[PDB]
Coordinates of C-alpha atoms and ligand atoms in Angstrom, one line a residue:
Chain A
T1017 CA 0.0 0.0 0.0
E1018 CA 1.2 3.5 -0.9
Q1019 CA -0.8 5.0 1.9
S1020 CA 0.8 2.8 4.5
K1021 CA 4.1 3.6 2.8
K1022 CA 3.3 7.3 3.4
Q1023 CA 2.3 6.7 6.9
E1024 CA 5.5 4.8 7.6
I1025 CA 7.6 7.6 6.2
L1026 CA 5.7 10.2 8.2
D1027 CA 6.3 8.1 11.3
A1028 CA 10.0 8.4 10.7
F1029 CA 9.7 12.2 10.4
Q1030 CA 7.9 12.3 13.8
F1031 CA 10.4 9.8 15.3
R1032 CA 13.4 12.0 14.4
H1033 CA 14.0 14.6 17.0
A1034 CA 17.0 16.7 18.2
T1035 CA 18.3 14.1 20.5
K1036 CA 20.3 15.8 23.2
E1037 CA 21.8 12.7 24.8
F1038 CA 22.2 9.1 23.5
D1039 CA 22.6 5.7 25.0
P1040 CA 26.3 5.5 25.9
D1041 CA 26.4 1.7 25.6
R1042 CA 24.5 1.3 22.3
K1043 CA 26.5 1.5 19.1
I1044 CA 25.1 1.9 15.6
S1045 CA 26.3 -1.1 13.6
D1046 CA 28.8 -0.6 10.8
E1047 CA 26.4 -1.7 8.0
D1048 CA 23.8 0.7 9.4
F1049 CA 26.2 3.6 9.7
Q1050 CA 27.5 2.9 6.1
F1051 CA 23.9 3.1 5.0
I1052 CA 23.7 6.5 6.7
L1053 CA 26.8 7.8 5.1
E1054 CA 25.7 6.5 1.7
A1055 CA 22.5 8.6 2.1
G1056 CA 24.9 11.5 2.4
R1057 CA 27.0 10.5 -0.6
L1058 CA 24.0 10.1 -2.9
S1059 CA 22.8 13.6 -2.0
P1060 CA 22.3 16.1 -4.9
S1061 CA 24.6 19.1 -5.0
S1062 CA 24.4 22.3 -7.1
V1063 CA 26.2 21.9 -10.4
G1064 CA 26.8 18.3 -9.2
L1065 CA 30.1 19.4 -7.6
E1066 CA 29.6 17.6 -4.2
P1067 CA 31.6 20.2 -2.4
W1068 CA 31.8 18.3 0.9
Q1069 CA 33.6 15.8 3.1
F1070 CA 32.1 13.8 6.0
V1071 CA 34.6 13.4 8.8
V1072 CA 33.7 10.7 11.3
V1073 CA 35.2 11.8 14.6
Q1074 CA 35.4 8.8 16.9
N1075 CA 38.7 9.7 18.4
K1076 CA 37.9 10.7 22.0
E1077 CA 40.6 13.3 22.5
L1078 CA 39.3 15.3 19.5
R1079 CA 35.6 14.9 20.5
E1080 CA 36.6 16.5 23.8
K1081 CA 38.5 19.3 22.2
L1082 CA 35.3 20.0 20.3
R1083 CA 33.1 19.6 23.3
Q1084 CA 35.0 22.4 25.0
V1085 CA 34.1 25.0 22.3
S1086 CA 30.6 23.5 21.3
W1087 CA 28.1 24.7 23.8
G1088 CA 25.3 23.1 21.7
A1089 CA 26.9 19.6 21.8
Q1090 CA 27.5 19.1 25.5
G1091 CA 25.4 15.9 25.7
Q1092 CA 25.8 14.7 22.1
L1093 CA 29.6 14.7 21.7
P1094 CA 30.3 12.4 24.7
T1095 CA 27.5 10.0 24.1
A1096 CA 27.0 9.8 20.3
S1097 CA 27.7 6.4 18.7
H1098 CA 29.0 8.2 15.7
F1099 CA 29.8 11.9 15.3
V1100 CA 30.2 13.6 12.0
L1101 CA 31.7 16.9 10.9
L1102 CA 30.4 18.0 7.6
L1103 CA 33.1 20.0 5.8
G1104 CA 32.5 22.2 2.8
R1105 CA 35.0 22.9 0.1
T1106 CA 36.4 26.4 0.5
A1107 CA 35.9 29.3 -1.9
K1108 CA 39.2 28.7 -3.7
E1109 CA 38.1 25.2 -4.6
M1110 CA 34.9 26.3 -6.3
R1111 CA 35.7 28.8 -9.1
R1112 CA 35.7 28.0 -12.8
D1113 CA 39.6 27.9 -12.6
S1114 CA 39.9 25.7 -9.6
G1115 CA 41.4 22.3 -9.9
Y1116 CA 38.7 20.6 -7.8
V1117 CA 35.9 21.7 -10.1
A1118 CA 37.7 20.7 -13.2
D1119 CA 38.7 17.3 -11.9
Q1120 CA 35.2 16.7 -10.4
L1121 CA 33.4 17.4 -13.7
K1122 CA 35.8 15.4 -15.9
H1123 CA 36.7 12.3 -13.9
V1124 CA 33.6 11.9 -11.6
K1125 CA 30.8 13.4 -13.7
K1126 CA 32.3 12.3 -17.1
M1127 CA 31.2 15.6 -18.6
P1128 CA 32.4 15.7 -22.3
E1129 CA 35.2 18.2 -23.1
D1130 CA 33.0 20.4 -25.3
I1131 CA 30.6 20.7 -22.4
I1132 CA 33.3 21.3 -19.8
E1133 CA 34.8 24.3 -21.5
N1134 CA 31.4 25.9 -22.2
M1135 CA 30.9 25.4 -18.5
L1136 CA 34.2 26.8 -17.3
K1137 CA 35.2 29.4 -19.9
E1138 CA 35.3 33.1 -18.9
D1139 CA 31.6 34.2 -18.6
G1140 CA 30.8 30.6 -19.0
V1141 CA 27.8 28.8 -17.5
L1142 CA 29.6 28.4 -14.1
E1143 CA 30.7 32.0 -13.8
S1144 CA 27.6 33.4 -15.3
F1145 CA 25.6 31.7 -12.5
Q1146 CA 28.1 32.1 -9.6
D1147 CA 28.8 35.8 -10.1
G1148 CA 25.8 37.2 -12.1
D1149 CA 23.0 35.1 -10.8
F1150 CA 23.9 34.5 -7.2
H1151 CA 26.7 37.0 -6.4
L1152 CA 29.1 34.4 -5.0
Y1153 CA 32.2 36.6 -5.9
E1154 CA 31.2 39.3 -3.4
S1155 CA 33.2 37.5 -0.6
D1156 CA 34.8 34.2 0.2
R1157 CA 32.0 33.9 2.8
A1158 CA 29.3 34.2 0.1
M1159 CA 30.9 31.4 -1.9
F1160 CA 31.4 29.2 1.2
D1161 CA 27.8 29.7 2.5
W1162 CA 26.6 28.5 -0.8
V1163 CA 28.8 25.4 -0.5
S1164 CA 27.5 25.0 3.0
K1165 CA 23.9 25.0 1.8
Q1166 CA 24.8 22.0 -0.3
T1167 CA 26.1 20.3 2.8
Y1168 CA 22.7 20.8 4.6
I1169 CA 21.1 18.6 1.9
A1170 CA 23.5 15.8 2.8
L1171 CA 22.7 16.5 6.5
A1172 CA 19.0 16.1 6.2
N1173 CA 19.2 13.0 4.1
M1174 CA 21.6 11.3 6.5
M1175 CA 19.3 12.2 9.4
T1176 CA 16.2 11.1 7.6
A1177 CA 17.9 7.9 6.5
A1178 CA 18.8 7.1 10.1
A1179 CA 15.3 7.8 11.4
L1180 CA 13.7 5.6 8.7
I1181 CA 15.6 2.7 10.3
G1182 CA 14.9 3.9 13.8
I1183 CA 18.3 5.5 14.5
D1184 CA 18.3 8.9 16.3
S1185 CA 20.3 11.9 15.5
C1186 CA 20.9 15.7 16.3
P1187 CA 22.0 18.4 13.9
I1188 CA 24.5 20.7 15.5
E1189 CA 25.4 24.3 14.8
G1190 CA 26.0 25.3 18.4
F1191 CA 29.8 25.6 18.2
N1192 CA 32.2 28.5 18.2
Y1193 CA 33.3 28.8 14.5
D1194 CA 36.6 30.4 15.1
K1195 CA 37.7 27.9 17.7
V1196 CA 36.5 24.9 15.8
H1197 CA 38.1 26.1 12.6
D1198 CA 41.4 26.5 14.5
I1199 CA 41.2 23.1 16.1
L1200 CA 40.6 21.3 12.8
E1201 CA 43.2 23.4 11.0
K1202 CA 45.9 22.4 13.5
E1203 CA 45.0 18.8 13.3
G1204 CA 45.1 18.6 9.5
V1205 CA 41.4 18.0 9.0
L1206 CA 40.9 21.1 6.8
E1207 CA 43.6 19.7 4.4
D1208 CA 45.7 22.8 3.6
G1209 CA 42.7 25.0 3.3
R1210 CA 40.7 22.9 0.9
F1211 CA 37.9 22.5 3.5
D1212 CA 36.3 24.4 6.3
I1213 CA 33.6 23.4 8.9
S1214 CA 30.0 23.8 7.9
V1215 CA 27.8 21.8 10.4
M1216 CA 28.0 18.8 12.7
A1217 CA 25.8 15.8 13.2
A1218 CA 25.5 13.2 16.0
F1219 CA 24.0 9.7 15.7
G1220 CA 22.9 7.1 18.1
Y1221 CA 20.0 5.7 20.1
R1222 CA 17.7 7.8 22.3
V1223 CA 17.8 7.4 26.1
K1224 CA 14.4 9.0 26.9
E1225 CA 11.2 9.4 25.0
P1226 CA 11.0 12.9 23.6
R1227 CA 8.5 15.6 24.3
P1228 CA 5.9 15.7 21.4
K1229 CA 6.9 17.5 18.2
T1230 CA 5.8 21.1 17.6
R1231 CA 5.6 22.7 14.1
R1232 CA 3.9 25.6 12.6
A1233 CA 0.6 24.6 10.8
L1234 CA 0.6 23.7 7.2
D1235 CA -1.8 26.6 6.8
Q1236 CA 0.8 29.1 7.9
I1237 CA 3.8 27.8 5.8
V1238 CA 2.2 26.9 2.5
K1239 CA 1.0 29.6 0.1
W1240 CA -0.5 28.6 -3.2
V1241 CA -0.5 30.9 -6.3
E1242 CA -3.1 29.3 -8.6
Chain B
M1099 CA 18.6 -9.3 9.7
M1100 CA 17.7 -9.8 6.1
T1101 CA 14.4 -7.9 6.5
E1102 CA 16.1 -4.8 7.8
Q1103 CA 18.8 -5.0 5.2
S1104 CA 15.9 -5.1 2.7
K1105 CA 14.3 -1.9 4.1
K1106 CA 17.7 -0.2 3.7
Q1107 CA 17.8 -1.3 0.1
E1108 CA 14.3 0.1 -0.6
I1109 CA 15.5 3.5 0.9
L1110 CA 18.7 3.5 -1.2
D1111 CA 16.7 2.7 -4.3
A1112 CA 14.7 5.8 -3.7
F1113 CA 17.9 7.8 -3.4
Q1114 CA 19.0 6.3 -6.7
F1115 CA 15.6 6.9 -8.2
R1116 CA 15.9 10.6 -7.4
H1117 CA 17.7 12.6 -10.0
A1118 CA 17.8 16.2 -11.4
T1119 CA 14.8 15.8 -13.6
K1120 CA 15.0 18.2 -16.6
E1121 CA 11.5 17.8 -18.0
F1122 CA 8.3 16.3 -16.6
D1123 CA 5.2 14.7 -18.1
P1124 CA 2.8 17.7 -18.5
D1125 CA -0.4 15.5 -18.3
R1126 CA 0.4 13.4 -15.3
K1127 CA -0.3 15.4 -12.2
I1128 CA 0.7 14.6 -8.6
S1129 CA -2.4 13.7 -6.6
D1130 CA -3.5 16.2 -4.0
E1131 CA -2.9 13.8 -1.2
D1132 CA 0.5 12.9 -2.4
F1133 CA 1.7 16.5 -2.8
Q1134 CA 0.4 17.3 0.7
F1135 CA 2.5 14.4 2.0
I1136 CA 5.5 16.0 0.2
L1137 CA 4.8 19.3 1.8
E1138 CA 4.4 17.6 5.2
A1139 CA 8.0 16.4 4.8
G1140 CA 9.0 20.0 4.5
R1141 CA 6.9 21.1 7.5
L1142 CA 8.4 18.3 9.7
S1143 CA 12.0 19.3 8.9
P1144 CA 14.3 20.3 11.7
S1145 CA 15.7 23.8 11.8
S1146 CA 18.2 25.7 13.9
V1147 CA 16.6 26.8 17.1
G1148 CA 13.5 25.2 15.8
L1149 CA 12.5 28.5 14.2
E1150 CA 11.3 27.0 10.9
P1151 CA 12.2 30.2 9.0
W1152 CA 10.6 29.1 5.7
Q1153 CA 7.6 29.5 3.5
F1154 CA 6.7 27.1 0.6
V1155 CA 5.0 28.9 -2.3
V1156 CA 3.3 26.5 -4.8
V1157 CA 3.4 28.3 -8.1
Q1158 CA 0.8 26.7 -10.4
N1159 CA -0.2 29.9 -12.1
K1160 CA 1.0 29.6 -15.7
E1161 CA 1.7 33.3 -16.2
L1162 CA 3.9 33.6 -13.1
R1163 CA 5.7 30.3 -13.9
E1164 CA 6.5 31.8 -17.3
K1165 CA 7.7 35.1 -15.9
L1166 CA 10.1 33.1 -13.6
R1167 CA 11.1 31.0 -16.6
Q1168 CA 12.3 34.0 -18.5
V1169 CA 14.9 34.7 -15.8
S1170 CA 15.7 31.1 -14.7
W1171 CA 18.1 29.5 -17.2
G1172 CA 18.2 26.4 -15.1
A1173 CA 14.5 25.8 -15.1
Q1174 CA 13.7 26.0 -18.8
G1175 CA 12.3 22.5 -19.0
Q1176 CA 10.9 22.1 -15.5
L1177 CA 8.8 25.2 -15.2
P1178 CA 6.4 24.6 -18.1
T1179 CA 6.0 20.9 -17.4
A1180 CA 6.1 20.4 -13.6
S1181 CA 3.1 18.9 -11.9
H1182 CA 4.0 21.2 -9.1
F1183 CA 6.6 24.0 -8.7
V1184 CA 7.7 25.3 -5.3
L1185 CA 9.5 28.4 -4.3
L1186 CA 11.3 28.0 -0.9
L1187 CA 11.4 31.3 0.8
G1188 CA 13.5 32.3 3.8
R1189 CA 12.8 34.8 6.5
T1190 CA 14.8 38.0 6.2
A1191 CA 17.4 39.2 8.7
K1192 CA 15.3 41.5 10.7
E1193 CA 12.8 38.6 11.3
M1194 CA 15.5 36.5 13.0
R1195 CA 16.7 38.5 15.9
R1196 CA 16.1 37.8 19.6
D1197 CA 13.5 40.6 19.9
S1198 CA 11.8 40.0 16.5
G1199 CA 8.2 39.1 16.9
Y1200 CA 8.5 36.2 14.5
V1201 CA 11.1 34.7 16.8
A1202 CA 9.3 35.6 20.1
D1203 CA 6.0 34.3 18.9
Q1204 CA 7.5 31.1 17.3
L1205 CA 9.3 30.1 20.4
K1206 CA 6.5 31.2 22.9
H1207 CA 3.5 29.7 21.1
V1208 CA 4.6 27.1 18.6
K1209 CA 7.6 25.6 20.5
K1210 CA 5.8 26.4 23.9
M1211 CA 9.2 27.3 25.4
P1212 CA 8.7 28.0 29.1
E1213 CA 9.3 31.4 30.5
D1214 CA 12.7 30.9 32.3
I1215 CA 14.1 29.2 29.2
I1216 CA 12.8 31.8 26.7
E1217 CA 14.2 34.5 28.9
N1218 CA 17.6 33.0 28.9
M1219 CA 17.3 32.3 25.2
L1220 CA 16.2 35.8 24.0
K1221 CA 17.8 38.1 26.6
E1222 CA 20.6 40.4 25.5
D1223 CA 23.8 38.3 25.2
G1224 CA 21.5 35.3 25.8
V1225 CA 21.8 32.0 24.1
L1226 CA 20.4 33.2 20.7
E1227 CA 22.5 36.4 20.4
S1228 CA 25.6 34.7 21.7
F1229 CA 25.2 32.0 19.0
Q1230 CA 24.1 34.3 16.2
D1231 CA 26.7 37.0 16.8
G1232 CA 29.6 35.4 18.7
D1233 CA 29.6 31.8 17.3
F1234 CA 28.4 32.2 13.7
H1235 CA 29.1 35.9 13.0
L1236 CA 25.6 36.4 11.6
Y1237 CA 25.3 40.0 12.7
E1238 CA 28.0 41.0 10.2
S1239 CA 25.4 41.6 7.4
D1240 CA 21.9 40.8 6.3
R1241 CA 23.2 38.3 3.8
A1242 CA 25.1 36.4 6.4
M1243 CA 21.9 36.1 8.4
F1244 CA 19.8 35.2 5.3
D1245 CA 22.2 32.6 4.1
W1246 CA 22.0 31.0 7.5
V1247 CA 18.2 30.9 7.2
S1248 CA 18.7 29.7 3.6
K1249 CA 20.7 26.7 4.8
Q1250 CA 17.7 25.6 6.9
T1251 CA 15.5 25.8 3.8
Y1252 CA 17.8 23.2 2.2
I1253 CA 16.9 20.7 4.9
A1254 CA 13.3 21.1 4.0
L1255 CA 14.2 20.9 0.3
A1256 CA 16.1 17.7 0.7
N1257 CA 13.4 16.0 2.7
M1258 CA 10.8 17.0 0.2
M1259 CA 12.7 15.4 -2.7
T1260 CA 13.6 12.3 -0.7
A1261 CA 9.9 11.9 0.3
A1262 CA 8.7 12.3 -3.2
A1263 CA 11.2 9.8 -4.5
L1264 CA 10.3 7.2 -1.8
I1265 CA 6.8 7.0 -3.4
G1266 CA 8.0 7.2 -7.0
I1267 CA 7.8 10.9 -7.6
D1268 CA 10.5 12.8 -9.4
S1269 CA 11.8 16.2 -8.4
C1270 CA 14.4 18.7 -9.4
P1271 CA 16.1 21.2 -7.1
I1272 CA 16.8 24.5 -8.9
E1273 CA 19.3 27.3 -8.2
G1274 CA 19.6 28.4 -11.8
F1275 CA 17.8 31.7 -11.6
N1276 CA 18.8 35.4 -11.5
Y1277 CA 18.2 36.4 -7.8
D1278 CA 17.7 40.1 -8.6
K1279 CA 15.1 39.7 -11.3
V1280 CA 13.4 36.8 -9.5
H1281 CA 13.5 38.9 -6.3
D1282 CA 11.8 41.9 -8.1
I1283 CA 9.1 39.7 -9.7
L1284 CA 8.2 38.2 -6.4
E1285 CA 8.2 41.6 -4.7
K1286 CA 5.8 43.1 -7.3
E1287 CA 3.6 40.0 -6.9
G1288 CA 3.4 40.5 -3.1
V1289 CA 4.9 37.0 -2.5
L1290 CA 7.6 38.3 -0.2
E1291 CA 5.2 39.9 2.3
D1292 CA 6.6 43.4 2.6
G1293 CA 10.2 42.1 2.9
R1294 CA 9.6 39.4 5.5
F1295 CA 10.8 36.8 3.0
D1296 CA 13.2 36.4 0.1
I1297 CA 13.8 33.6 -2.4
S1298 CA 16.1 30.8 -1.3
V1299 CA 15.9 27.9 -3.8
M1300 CA 13.2 26.3 -6.0
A1301 CA 12.0 22.8 -6.5
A1302 CA 10.0 21.1 -9.2
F1303 CA 8.0 17.9 -8.8
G1304 CA 6.3 15.6 -11.2
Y1305 CA 6.8 12.4 -13.3
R1306 CA 9.8 11.8 -15.6
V1307 CA 9.4 11.6 -19.4
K1308 CA 12.9 10.1 -20.1
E1309 CA 15.1 7.7 -18.2
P1310 CA 18.2 9.4 -16.8
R1311 CA 21.9 8.7 -17.4
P1312 CA 23.6 6.7 -14.7
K1313 CA 24.2 8.6 -11.5
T1314 CA 27.7 9.7 -10.6
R1315 CA 29.2 10.5 -7.3
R1316 CA 32.7 10.7 -5.8
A1317 CA 34.0 7.5 -4.2
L1318 CA 33.2 6.8 -0.6
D1319 CA 36.8 7.0 0.3
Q1320 CA 37.0 10.4 -1.4
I1321 CA 34.2 12.0 0.6
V1322 CA 34.4 10.1 4.0
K1323 CA 37.3 10.3 6.4
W1324 CA 37.5 8.5 9.8
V1325 CA 39.4 9.9 12.7
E1326 CA 39.6 7.0 15.1
Ligands
FMN2101 C1 21.1 23.1 11.3 C2 20.7 22.8 12.8 C3 21.5 23.0 13.9 C4 21.0 22.7 15.2 N1 21.8 23.0 16.2 C5 21.6 22.4 17.4 C6 22.6 22.3 18.5 O1 23.7 22.8 18.3 N2 22.3 21.7 19.6 C7 21.1 21.1 19.8 O2 20.9 20.5 20.8 N3 20.1 21.1 18.8 C8 20.3 21.7 17.6 N4 19.3 21.8 16.6 C9 18.0 21.2 17.0 C10 16.8 22.1 16.9 O3 16.6 22.8 18.1 C11 15.6 21.2 16.6 O4 15.8 20.5 15.3 C12 14.2 22.0 16.6 O5 14.1 22.6 17.9 C13 13.1 21.1 16.1 O6 12.9 20.0 17.0 P1 13.0 18.5 16.4 O7 14.3 18.5 15.7 O8 12.9 17.6 17.6 O9 11.8 18.4 15.5 C14 19.7 22.2 15.4 C15 18.9 21.9 14.3 C16 19.3 22.2 13.0 C17 18.4 21.9 11.8
FMN2102 C1 20.7 23.3 -4.7 C2 20.7 22.7 -6.0 C3 20.4 23.5 -7.1 C4 20.4 23.0 -8.4 N1 20.1 23.8 -9.5 C5 19.7 23.2 -10.6 C6 19.1 23.9 -11.7 O1 18.8 25.1 -11.7 N2 18.7 23.3 -12.8 C7 18.9 22.0 -13.0 O2 18.6 21.4 -14.0 N3 19.5 21.2 -12.0 C8 20.0 21.8 -10.9 N4 20.6 21.0 -9.9 C9 20.8 19.6 -10.2 C10 22.3 19.1 -10.0 O3 23.0 19.4 -11.3 C11 22.3 17.6 -9.8 O4 21.5 17.4 -8.5 C12 23.7 17.0 -9.6 O5 24.3 17.0 -10.9 C13 23.6 15.6 -9.2 O6 22.8 14.9 -10.1 P1 21.4 14.1 -9.6 O7 20.6 15.0 -8.7 O8 20.8 13.8 -11.0 O9 22.0 12.8 -8.8 C14 20.6 21.5 -8.6 C15 20.9 20.7 -7.5 C16 20.9 21.3 -6.2 C17 21.2 20.5 -5.0
CB1_2103 N1 21.2 26.1 -17.2 C1 22.2 25.1 -16.9 O1 22.9 24.7 -17.8 C2 22.4 24.6 -15.5 C3 22.3 25.5 -14.4 C4 22.5 25.1 -13.1 N2 22.4 26.0 -12.0 C5 23.7 26.4 -11.5 C6 23.0 27.3 -12.4 C7 22.7 23.7 -12.9 N3 22.8 23.3 -11.5 O2 22.6 24.2 -10.5 O3 23.1 22.1 -11.3 C8 22.7 22.8 -13.9 C9 22.6 23.3 -15.2 N4 22.7 22.2 -16.2 O4 21.8 22.1 -17.0 O5 23.8 21.4 -16.2
CB1_2104 N1 23.2 25.2 24.0 C1 21.8 25.4 23.6 O1 21.0 25.7 24.5 C2 21.3 25.3 22.2 C3 22.1 25.8 21.1 C4 21.6 25.6 19.8 N2 22.5 26.1 18.7 C5 22.0 27.4 18.1 C6 23.1 27.4 19.0 C7 20.4 25.1 19.5 N3 19.9 24.9 18.2 O2 20.8 25.3 17.1 O3 18.8 24.5 18.0 C8 19.6 24.6 20.6 C9 20.1 24.7 21.9 N4 19.2 24.2 22.9 O4 19.5 23.4 23.6 O5 17.8 24.7 22.9

């Protein structure tokens, strides 16, 4: 039944909540966590450039360094079965003349040469969109925030995938950007400036049943223009 | 054991089913129930501070679709043929501050945040301002604040597409549009509600007409790193 299918999926959306603390002795199995990451990997990205890395931070020392500067993750970092930093490619990786773009489109996407150079010429498709349409050249931040929006697609899907098999999660922005950037830079995670932190994500099994879910009414958030 | 591994396969199949659909079947329409389920996936999406700073605008009007089409080089095929077209709007910067009414009413009446919490949350140099200004540098400009809001709308966009694909419905996320012209069109149309909203990203839904090329993604060991 497609109606029972829809109910099941909506049950997962209700099940998923912002888990603040997980069961410290229950670990997501490796197959299950690979399924979660694959939901991330299969995510769509603007221009198909996949401007992200998923860093699985199981090392306890590093978790604790992050906990110290992440006032939104106080419960999640120590107790998560798996903890993920979602990195975005940095602004220098994303221009028409960046190696990463060129390699991504040629060797991953198998874009034919004639298409590539239409895409990456001066005032090509990529620049016409990045600069003219979306103003991503105004600052490195503007470029990176656009990258980071891509990463939130991967974040939702990983969270939704987990919930659909009954695994809890919590998206996490509650960190000091400067201090986290510095921590990861020093440790080599940002890879000589190819990456920067976008958002974090914890996964595991709930300890308590959550309070009921609250959302604005469909009537408030949906406008139709017939 | 094998049944759970099969449920995971069903899910992955939906993620493989979903693709950037360039053109839809203009006769096959998404049922009203099914599209309301898609929208529910958006509504139920998580958001920073649970502020749900979005509005979903379903643009079925042919005239408006075509006005948008004239300025959206990425949507040439999708806009005329989509069963449903959605503009994801984000709240603007002045809506998102600790003493904005949108924020105050959202947390007080939708989230039902109790009084001592909401006081710590919205007070000066309270939790919200310390996060917005100290941690994420969102006071630096209206765009920084809006792009943060806009990131949240991409959670709702992702869940809408995945939900659609789980029941066999195609989608296409769309950034290929001129912000300025699209902004002005939506202003003149009154869609942005006197500057409370601005355009974030758009999404088309419907039924494919062509089968897609094989999906390509970077290798798992290219996009995943473990720090054990
Ligand atoms: C991008 C993002 C960042 C978030 N940051 C945090 C965080 O740092 N710590 C936390 O406990 N919850 C965080 N949340 C959880 C929200 O408060 C929560 O999703 C919202 O209140 C809705 O409740 P629900 O997720 O249970 O439906 C975040 C949510 C999102 C989408
Ligand atoms: C945020 C976003 C915006 C996009 N913009 C457009 C667009 O304007 N027009 C279009 O045809 N495709 C667009 N795409 C589709 C991407 O090219 C596509 O998702 C990517 O190449 C991966 O291919 P797949 O989704 O077919 O797996 C967009 C995708 C995302 C995530
Ligand atoms: N009109 C286009 O050629 C276009 C534009 C965009 N958006 C970036 C401007 C995207 N895309 O976002 O994936 C993809 C395409 N494309 O068809 O490969
Ligand atoms: N440390 C917190 O109190 C905190 C921080 C954040 N992030 C914004 C800083 C979020 N949240 O993002 O939802 C939620 C909370 N919270 O527990 O209600």
